[PDB]
Amino acid sequence: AQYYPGTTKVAQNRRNFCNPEYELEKLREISDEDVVKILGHRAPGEEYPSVHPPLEEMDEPEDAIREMVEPIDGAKAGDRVRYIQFTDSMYFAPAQPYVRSRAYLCRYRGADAGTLSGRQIIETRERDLEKISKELLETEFFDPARSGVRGKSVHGHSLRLDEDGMMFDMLRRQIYNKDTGRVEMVKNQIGDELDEPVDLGEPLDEETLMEKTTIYRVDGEAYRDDVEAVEIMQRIHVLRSQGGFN
Amino acid sequence: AKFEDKVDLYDDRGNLVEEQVPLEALSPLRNPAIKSIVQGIKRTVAVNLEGIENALKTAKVGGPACKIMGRELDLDIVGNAESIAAAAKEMIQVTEDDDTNVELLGGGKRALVQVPSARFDVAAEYSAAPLVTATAFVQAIINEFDVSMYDANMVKAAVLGRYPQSVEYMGANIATMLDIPQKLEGPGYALRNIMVNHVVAATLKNTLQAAALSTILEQTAMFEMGDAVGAFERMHLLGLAYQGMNADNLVFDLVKANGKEGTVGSVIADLVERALEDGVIKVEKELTDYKVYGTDDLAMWNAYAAAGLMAATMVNQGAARAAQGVSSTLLYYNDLIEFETGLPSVDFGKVEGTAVGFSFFSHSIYGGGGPGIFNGNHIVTRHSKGFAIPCVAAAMALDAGTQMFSPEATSGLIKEVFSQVDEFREPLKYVVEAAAEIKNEI
Amino acid sequence: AKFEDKVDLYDDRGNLVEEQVPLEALSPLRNPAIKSIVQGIKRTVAVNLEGIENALKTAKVGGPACKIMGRELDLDIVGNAESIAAAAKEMIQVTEDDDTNVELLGGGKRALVQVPSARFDVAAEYSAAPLVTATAFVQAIINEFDVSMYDANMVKAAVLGRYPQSVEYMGANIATMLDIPQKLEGPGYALRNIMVNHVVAATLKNTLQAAALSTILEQTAMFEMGDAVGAFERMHLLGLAYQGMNADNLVFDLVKANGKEGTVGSVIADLVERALEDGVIKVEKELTDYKVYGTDDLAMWNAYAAAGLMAATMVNQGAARAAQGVSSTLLYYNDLIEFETGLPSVDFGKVEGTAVGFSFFSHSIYGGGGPGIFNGNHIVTRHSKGFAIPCVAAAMALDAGTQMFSPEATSGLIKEVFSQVDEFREPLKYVVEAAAEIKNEI
Amino acid sequence: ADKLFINALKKKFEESPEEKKTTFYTLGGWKQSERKTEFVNAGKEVAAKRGIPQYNPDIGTPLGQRVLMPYQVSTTDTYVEGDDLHFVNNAAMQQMWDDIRRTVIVGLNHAHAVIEKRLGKEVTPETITHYLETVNHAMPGAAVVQEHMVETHPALVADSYVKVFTGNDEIADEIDPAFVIDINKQFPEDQAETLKAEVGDGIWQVVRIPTIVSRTCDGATTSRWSAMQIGMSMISAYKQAAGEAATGDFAYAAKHAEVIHMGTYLPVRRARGENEPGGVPFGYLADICQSSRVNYEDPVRVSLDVVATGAMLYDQIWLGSYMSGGVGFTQYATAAYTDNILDDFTYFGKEYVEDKYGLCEAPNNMDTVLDVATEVTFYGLEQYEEYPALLEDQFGGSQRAAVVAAAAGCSTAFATGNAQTGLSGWYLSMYLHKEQHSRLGFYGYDLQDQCGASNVFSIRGDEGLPLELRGPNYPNYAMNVGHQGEYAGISQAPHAARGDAFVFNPLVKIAFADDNLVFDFTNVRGEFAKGALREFEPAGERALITPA
């Protein structure tokens, strides 16, 4: 597959995020337990709540499609559907809202992905969400200064940075340690305080941000200069218009 | 025939049934089984005799929480259902041995009622079914128990609710698949104002049969609306064949190839591959490490794209066994395919647009709800002309129990009564066989 | 036969046509001429090609006084009407020898379009006729003149108006006798939302034919509403026969015996006499210089009283050649007959009640208008179940020019186009002949 | 010269607009705001008085971790906090809607025929003036025929009256000028001649029923109220029987046959009668706005005054209350009429078109759309990239999408003189925006925008329509903020560039060229500012009948 047109680094980065063959760079290590605490849906050690029985106990009807589509583990178990949501700064965060949604539905099974300007969300079965959330937090999808995990009060994607280069956050869920240059998450994604903060590592430097970002900007790579990408968008507009008429 | 196209027809297990059938043998205007389904939907009414009886016993009539103290009537309706049903049938039928049908279910608790076709030959629309059924059962109940003039108006209230003070049958103990004509978003929309949950209920959650019935209703509505006239007729017929009837086994095969490990993106890759091989699309132009695809037949590209869209829904929501993500699949299948090919998405953007609002109004405070309460007449999901709603039906069919407003919550009476009609429960079998039987008359 | 009643059928000149016809031979459910009239009204559209041309040349589209400067298009539509009509017919038909009909009138200024019956077999209601006709003519006009993508939307606006921003086809240059389903006062009312002027226009002001078409529409609606089911069926059949179909020449004879000098009061006297002679009523009790009448057959009394009501309208409004008094006739014929006999008036007081509000809303500031703008779906005149509106049609047929909102003001397009269809213009003929042909299969 | 939005950005923030970094969290939350402070103290008083807790700054999340910005009302030097632009808090926005809702246009052409032909009486300018004197007594709720009638208090209903207009200059001069909307005095000469040619010898009434009645009742009341007092005034002035058959022709004429509603009724899911905001087509809204007869030399100003009219009505009152409610959609709308941002983007596009093509001289085709809409879209987006303060100002993507696309679409229509290609440019802007920043608007922002391109030029039943005829009930458009008001501006744009006197209905244009309205429709944005400063005096209050 080709995923996306264009000849900028931005276009290539958009392609890499979507490409399931492309190995996302791992930048940090987060414990399984700390993923659960960030998500905030259950306590580590707690059993997964269920919304319906396991599929094996349901005896569901003869249906060639059901037989042919393997459910994800959480669906077999009857897990709740829960979520993780990210806000990405327009100042060169690596991932961006439509990039995320496009990439999730190329990479992950059983995904409900939504895109907004200030938030991007994925809802799926609880135990599968935890495996996905680790990769979304450990890899280049995430920078702890220009990206944030926020289930509410998402304001920030369009705001100026603070003096440390951190994105604004109403609820100050992620804190830059000026004396050590590392970001700690001190609350879960809905804003409740954590017993012990989680280390998220060092912010990427601006040079690396520019190299990895998927946003076009005049002070990075401008969309108007990626003429092959622009041409394809104008083409879709023209063909949609003609199709609708005749 | 007006079109040269022919399609291979398959059954719901992936088996060939008939080869190279003219496209118009699947047309609502020509296929007699579609005619049977549409007329059956117009004329079929479910009556809840247990509910009528309980409403009279408690004087709970006219809507939620309503009660008139002092008006209670204790009548043994379920215990006399056979005699009530027979008296009702004589009033409903036009002649002895016509196509009237009145069957009791659940030991007299419900009644399946199919009003004779002759009544609709001299009717403008479809309300004769509930209104003739309602008054026949009201009269039969009054006659069975010698209900007095002074009390009979409570029986009326128990059957048809607060009508005519309300415009709808508010609190009624009868049910239809269709809603009243006043609630149409526009003329010609009636076959679209059928709740997705009703379709899933009538087909007992068989994914391909729910997709088929939904597609039949949506695309038949497009003829009544005039959308499938002239230059657009072929597009709509191809969408009906490929997205809803598993033409050429394309949907089935895409799901087979992607069901164990697939994603939406992997279904897209296979579909583009198949479209290239079958000659539907061709390389038109080369950019830097990117091929621009073109097509000489937009209607056929649309149909292929729409079959993949179905398969992607089946694969994504089938994996989660959770319907809610269908709004995401409908959006990003189409968004991804456009930047994969340089060609327009299904319904030239209208499925993607429908999916945007459908996502918002199924994950926000402002309205809508869960996937099963939507329909082609809903302001949120009316914009695509038949290519989005059948995927919602398929996704709800695959839902294992994640919805609070499930078909069991909204459509129990439909499940119990309408699923009994063979053409409603397995429409794919009957439409395909009828198409073979007429293949050489088209 | 369910009912043993038989009637003698006459023509619009009082000559007998067939003796001892069983009542149900006139039933909307059985009589094939009525089926043909109902299906015809559903499927017939008038296209004003002259109006389309003028709207485009001036860019006057979308409603009263509306105009979009800079959008004017100058197309010679009327001069190419034959080619446009042929192209549109190819889009409207289903097959090459179906009942599709497209005929040009007034030298191409107007078109009579009858959409094929087959499209309504697989339709929920009747809106396919305007919608399929509009898009076929829009596409045919675009293709004839190679109108560009950029301008075509103006052709759409000239044909169908402000729809879908408006719910109605506001500013449209097509016309039907039926209105959009959203405007029904209640489910099953569609055949009642036909303006009286439309009926009078289509029958070219022949009084009896206007009465008959109005009565056929009203009483057929009573079956779609479920009002003529079970215990009430016979009452409505007898009302159809005696009030709208001049059964037993009763309406005719009463008008003949009273036309030269008669009043409402003298018609009543002759009717009571006749109902006595035929044994419909009998003296039940004597008061002081006053005979109280009774009846063993309320439905037959109602039908006789309904015929006298028709005759009273004809005599009273015919003498004035001015329709306005029909509201007074409908009131005091029934008020007088009750105190004359001690029996209840037509429709058990509902005609009298309808006449009260109808008089008020045709002689005051609050709403309504002249007799010709009312119909069975109007809130003022919906209350009687088929026994009032046919008298209004007769009264307007006899008006000699006292009305500002006359049929020529409201219904000119219906006059020119729908009067061309024989079964719409002379329904009494076709229905009587059809009842004769089947009299032995009942 | 500086961009037009720079002054506003300098007054909002201590930093210079180009700076990328600022400080948060030390402003004191709500205490930074005079308006929030007023609200906190009022909430304490309300809670104490009624015995039920109400506004409380400690519920939910703590507002004001960033600067709570003032907003410049565009074309003015008035700066106000955004709460002063909420429709609930702004009597000028409420009166604008009331003045539309309580208005209907009613012909006298059928009525006068009934008089002459059915009754056999004469109609002269003298009888018309007598009728107008009678109906201006009757219309507010006062009696002309019956004994022992009780009546409305004239001071409560002082805003209700009836005027006429006609294209026949001779009749207009015979009628007492107190009752006449003088087309020649209210419109420039070229516009007046077009309007008079449309109206011809027809005579039309502009009826305004009382605000207090409109607020008590609904929009569907207006044409009924109007028709009853027209009917009584016709009875009185032309000496009919007080209730004969002919009286019914006048009622049918005034209620149906020659009535122009401002909005048409809506289908059941969003059931509403006539003269509600959802029924008002975009062409009508542009014609209600009177900027076109005062600012005709500047087609940007005319177009953006229409945007302001529609953004407020359609997003804040219609979508933000009638169809949802609560805190609502103030800033989805204010993005279109504050800080001179949209004005900058659109003045740029007008200069682009005028230099390359000349106004209205570009080919009306898709080549012009791809050119103008792309160039203006890239310009607008670049301003947010060069000025971090601007991006923090219009912080929601929906807001930015609406403003950029409005500039692009209006500019495209300036080039082609046709609103349908302007509409195509609106949608292309959306697609480019979405790919440039990998975001667009809220979750459901671009439902209509993805449907958009294919439905611009469609001709199918519920798809095809010229933009001027579309409105809030056009199917794709029926649900979402950030579009409807901007569409009204695109509808106005080609007609402003061409110098047209009206967009869609000349009777509507004339009916609001009336100095006795309460809201000043020639200066919509100035009126919003006056209401924000609490200096607007509405009609319909009940102070006269309530205690001190």
Ligand SMILES: C[C@@H](OP(=O)(O)O)[C@H](NC(=O)CCCCCCS)C(=O)O
């Ligand atoms: C969708 C529909 O809601 P329901 O699904 O019928 O509950 C509709 N609301 C809306 O359109 C909300 C529009 C305003 C809020 C969203 C602005 S983007 C309505 O209330 O009639």
Ligand SMILES: C[C@@H](OP(=O)(O)O)[C@H](NC(=O)CCCCCCS)C(=O)O
């Ligand atoms: C009849 C109908 O008027 P129209 O014939 O549709 O103009 C209707 N008015 C009324 O019912 C007036 C009722 C209030 C005044 C009379 C009270 S006795 C209405 O406005 O919808």
Ligand SMILES: O=S(=O)(O)CCS
């Ligand atoms: O977040 S949502 O897009 O659902 C609503 C924005 S106001």
Ligand SMILES: [Mg+2]
């Ligand atoms: Mg690990």
Ligand SMILES: [Mg+2]
């Ligand atoms: Mg096979």
Ligand SMILES: [Mg+2]
């Ligand atoms: Mg005697």
Ligand SMILES: [Mg+2]
């Ligand atoms: Mg003033």
